[PDB]
Design a protein around this ligand. Structure first.
Ligand SMILES: Nc1ncnc2c1ncn2[C@@H]1O[C@H](COP(=O)(O)OP(=O)(O)NP(=O)(O)O)[C@@H](O)[C@H]1O
Ligand SMILES: Nc1ncnc2c1ncn2[C@@H]1O[C@H](COP(=O)(O)OP(=O)(O)NP(=O)(O)O)[C@@H](O)[C@H]1O
Ligand SMILES: Nc1ncnc2c1ncn2[C@@H]1O[C@H](COP(=O)(O)OP(=O)(O)NP(=O)(O)O)[C@@H](O)[C@H]1O
Ligand SMILES: [Mg+2]
Ligand SMILES: [Mg+2]
Ligand SMILES: [Mg+2]
Lengths: 47, 372, 47, 372, 372, 47
């Protein structure tokens, strides 16, 4: 038995808190955005 | 003495304005801020501190701090600054010739009244002044002269049973759980979804979220169940950086702490059942009229559905034969101040002022004799 | 005419009630000790 | 059946011990406590509840609650737990082979006595038991044939006249103002100086403050007038966290509510003028010996100055030619238990026990025929 | 179920090992690295990614990145890679038959737990698993059940007040100022002296410099003053290239930002004054035992002089009459893991495991019901 | 011979009598009704 995948909500980059973009130079920050609204950011890929 | 001033220097908003007006002239926040970073730009003329709307708008660069904590003046320099602002900038009035009425929470330390009176008479030089309890004014605002009048502003909640103009001081109840603590609890639960907020400006953002999206559940377990099924209960919000929040359960978990203080760790009972306990402390014959005149007031009584929820709770606690009627005029937020604007206008009230010569003849101790 | 200052008694920080340290992050609490005990507390200044 | 047990189920302090002895074997608060916050440490083995000194010591983590209110058992599960503790842990005695004497306030609900006897005979299997009024035990303690007892422990104040061994039940007076109620007033008045206290553990701290610093005035207006020059009457107290409270007027304002119940909002007369009224309801010839044998008992008669305040008031009320003489032995707190231990050892009293064989033939209704 | 595994998913250092052992079997950085430059030799033994010590040693060619940021998993592919590494290469253990205990920071996003549980049950297929908060494990490693526990790893600092087995969730405090963020400040301030580490490989060199040279003060101002005698403070360091660095003020400027977050622009109070605030949020009776049992844990409490600095600050804040005793065992770095290796061994704890069936009957939501 | 259990009558909370809600904050007041005749109150449970 497997359950459906549970997904992380897109992060809000506050001035101090759960994430900051400079902490991990090896990921690019990428935006997630649909229905005219951008739920926040994810960390990904190269360069 | 042409026109009185009235001020509700509560924990959230400084509602101030002249007597006879039906609405306050200025509702700027009771906030003082200092620059957090160094001012590299020469010749900009930046000030050393900001107050009210200036601090609120430029919050991104300031360390916002409230001089009021749970209805008590904690920093008298910043409070004197707020007094100076509300007199000279917002109202554009020289206070040295206008009598002033101030509204304070009950069961406050006496030294607070003493130092407030010293400030009013010795640096602003008002010709007369008076101190009135915030909840009693919401009776004049509602026009009636009987009720278990209840206030939940930003700093405290309290309820003060009055019947036919006589107060029942032994039945006064007070809780230090209100708009500030609810905002902090909303910040705490927003981390469950990853929305971390730690700075003082982010408290103002979470206060906006609190005021715009929160509501009170009629049945907490049912709202929890319907929120646990993915559904239209969940709402989005847009930050001043344009990043978009969504909140589900949190938008009724926050106001529910007024009814279950266990969530914020307090042992005390909620806003309901403390209002019932003050009704029980009253005389046996008085309770018939208190149940029918449960007047609400103050900012944190504005959550949608609060009246129905509390009515259900009180009808559950109270005897079944009782008809119960919560009174909530749409102007809840300004009702304490509206009450002061009525009171200061009365011909019968004009003898109850603390005159300048009454102060300098007996010191600040005059307040406990002249005032409630 | 003037009258002597009515100094505010130092606040006793009960677990719940009319005083708490964290409610105002713009002030630091300081010791106001007299005769070998702190009495209550006062809040001022940066951090 | 070798030795009887004696228990004063105090609203604040359970006092228990074997008969014949001049001091109770064990004294502990009548407190049952539940853990407030959630436990996280597996294998520490926390109990689900605590009682007596266990609850008092760990009060910071518990929601202390009193099963007794004004001498009436309000929660019988916690009261049964307190019974079980005071038998099996403190006295370390199986009650199924020891006769037991219990002390109760007068004018109590009859169902309280009936269910107390039911508990004694069905879940503890006590071979024989008796109920005596708390105040009458104070005359055995003082060794007197005649007197107007005033008893006030934590729950009630009450006064019973007895003359040559005959009670005067129609002259009994009772007030529900006592220790716990008077502690709450101290919590209220401490907010005047800014010292807020809300939780029940902090109410225990306020009780400690009262017991260690409070006293009764000789003339309340002269203490109020001298407290204006507030240097001499102020005393300090150290909280468990290390803060120091300093109190002035409050240390005599709080005990004065006994002599003036108007402070807590009650209409009834003070601790004085109710003793005097009980004397007025007595026969004309009885009053001579009552004025000279006014016997104080119970915990809240322990304040410094109490005998002087009450003697001054009674002399002011009573006829001038009568020599008022208030009796106050230093063992006021345990006097009720001492009288219970005395009479339980009397050879003549052994006929008056409610036997198990009598209860199983007449039930909890037996108490109204055997006991006063 | 043979023997439980215990894992601390350190933001800087993963710790793994079996229960009952007093030290973790394997410790390696939580680093996943990709080849930055193109490969030209054919059949070199190529891998598309390196993890742990392989990435750390080959760092000159790899773009090292941390899946953990401030205690939260920011990339799940690299985290699954790290999980697979610590199971199959370091421990050399098939996780299909070993229950696993994981240590997480408090106030984390619930989705972090739910996806972690889904991973451990659906790709590594552990028979049972549990989540525990790192501070409670440190308190177990102290052999203690009462006291403030302050854990500051590479990702976050957090303090959790515990008393006699009960946690105080409303008093928990959290800061993102920690080891990784502290290395970045050293990277910034090293440019004051000309050194210009910019790459993620040089990040590790700066971390090594911090770990081997940095220390804390008794008075930051005095250490700044001793920079006038600019010979005694300075220490040398040799890079892998052979270049020799010398640093003065920077070696204690970097740790000092823990006590003054203003250095890196944060508004919140330091590592001190947040422990003190968490203590003051606790119940009044609770605080006596908290000051005497201030346990530390985590890698950033390892700077020499941390105990002295924080003891001085806490004694300055807390009342003078209260004895303050910071507990700093030598094994602070592994104390979270040792706490887990105790907890997972307890015979009583065997009922707390989230079994495979308890997951597959209720999905990843099970954690919020079973775990704290 | 186990006799039947007697029941404590529900407390009628007057203004200053032997009953008051605030005396034990560890109990909540609960209404014990009977077909609209509310009787009085008994106290139990949290809050
Ligand atoms: N629509 C709303 N919904 C929910 N909360 C509100 C709303 N409007 C205002 N508030 C809250 O109410 C506070 C202001 O209420 P207000 O009556 O002005 O308090 P106050 O008088 O300053 N406080 P106080 O006198 O100390 O009790 C705000 O800071 C918010 O916490
Ligand atoms: N030294 C003291 N000074 C003043 N008040 C005291 C003192 N010691 C105890 N108290 C008060 O007296 C109460 C205990 O008195 P006590 O006679 O033992 O009452 P009790 O037996 O618990 N209840 P009761 O059944 O009403 O007699 C405490 O709960 C306090 O309210
Ligand atoms: N000897 C040391 N001196 C100073 N700092 C050190 C030392 N050892 C480790 N550190 C710092 O602490 C970090 C690792 O500490 P550790 O206790 O392993 O935290 P973690 O478990 O990796 N993080 P978290 O999951 O948030 O607890 C390193 O990356 C450094 O930043
Ligand atoms: Mg207000
Ligand atoms: Mg007693
Ligand atoms: Mg860690």
């Amino acid at each position: 038995k497997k359950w459906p995948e549970v997904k992380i909500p897109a992060r809000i980059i506050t001035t101090s808190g759960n994430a900051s973009v400079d902490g991990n130079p090896g990921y690019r920050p990428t935006r997630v955005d649909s229905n005219g609204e951008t739920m926040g950011y994810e960390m990904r890929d190269r360069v | 003495e042409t026109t009185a001033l009235v001020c509700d220097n509560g924990s959230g908003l400084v509602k101030a304005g002249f007597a006879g007006d039906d609405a306050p002239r200025a509702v700027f926040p009771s906030i003082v801020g200092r620059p957090r970073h160094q001012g590299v730009m020469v010749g900009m003329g930046q000030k050393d501190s900001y107050v009210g709307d200036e601090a609120q708008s430029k919050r991104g660069i300031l360390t916002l701090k409230y001089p009021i904590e749970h209805g008590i003046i904690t920093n008298w320099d910043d409070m004197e600054k707020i007094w100076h602002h509300t007199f000279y900038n917002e109202l554009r009035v020289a206070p040295e010739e206008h009598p002033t009425l101030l509204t304070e929470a009950p069961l406050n330390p006496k030294a607070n009244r003493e130092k407030m009176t010293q400030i009013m008479f010795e640096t602003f030089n008002v010709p007369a002044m008076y101190v009135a309890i915030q909840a009693v004014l919401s009776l004049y605002a509602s026009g009636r002269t009987t009720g278990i009048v209840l206030d939940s502003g930003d700093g405290v909640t309290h309820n003060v049973p009055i019947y036919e103009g006589y107060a029942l001081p032994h039945a006064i109840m007070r809780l230090d759980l209100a708009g500030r603590d609810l905002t902090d609890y909303l910040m705490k639960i927003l981390t469950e979804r990853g929305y971390s907020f730690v700075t003082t400006a982010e408290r103002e953002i979470v206060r906006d979220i609190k005021e715009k999206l929160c509501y009170v559940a009629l049945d907490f377990e049912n709202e929890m169940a319907t929120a646990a099924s993915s559904s239209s209960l969940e709402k989005s919000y847009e930050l001043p950086d344009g990043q978009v929040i969504t909140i589900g359960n949190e938008r009724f978990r926050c106001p529910e702490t007024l009814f279950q203080p266990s969530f914020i760790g307090m042992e005390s009972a909620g806003i309901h059942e403390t209002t019932y306990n003050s009704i029980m402390k009253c005389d046996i014959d008085i309770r018939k009229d208190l149940y029918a005149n449960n007047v609400m007031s103050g900012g944190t009584t504005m959550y949608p559905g609060i009246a129905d929820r509390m009515q259900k709770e009180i009808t559950a606690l109270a005897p079944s034969t009782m008809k119960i009627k919560i009174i909530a005029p749409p102007e809840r937020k300004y009702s304490v101040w509206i009450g002061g604007s009525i009171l200061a206008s009365l011909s019968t009230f004009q003898q109850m002022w603390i005159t300048k010569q009454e102060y300098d003849e007996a010191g600040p101790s005059i307040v406990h004799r002249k005032c409630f």
